Amino acid sequence: STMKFCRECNNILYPKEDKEQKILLYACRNCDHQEVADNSCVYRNEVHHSVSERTQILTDVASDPTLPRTKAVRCSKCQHREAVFFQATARGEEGMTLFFVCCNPNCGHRWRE
């Protein structure tokens, strides 16, 4: 994922390795000159998933799915069902605990556990 240009040659060098003397020596195709490696890193990439190329609103795939709902709890101030639930951490805790957010409009309530 790297490329260098040859001095007074102007070609793309090749990352080969010497057998006896263990040193990364860069060699170009036509001039066949030698040059040491100042970085020792022949690959660098911020690799992502990249499984959907221009297929967001044209395909039914989902990168970030929605949060589920449950109707078995009753909120305190709103007194209504159909609240969401997930698992997260709060200010440092060994493990994850259950959370709740009231999905009813004009309620604005969220209680731990």
Binding site: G92, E93, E94, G95, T97, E113
Partner: peptide, 10 residues
């Protein structure tokens, strides 16, 4: 009862 709230640090 519920799960105890074990903190990470001391």
């Amino acid at each position: 009862g519920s799960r105890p709230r074990l903190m990470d640090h001391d």
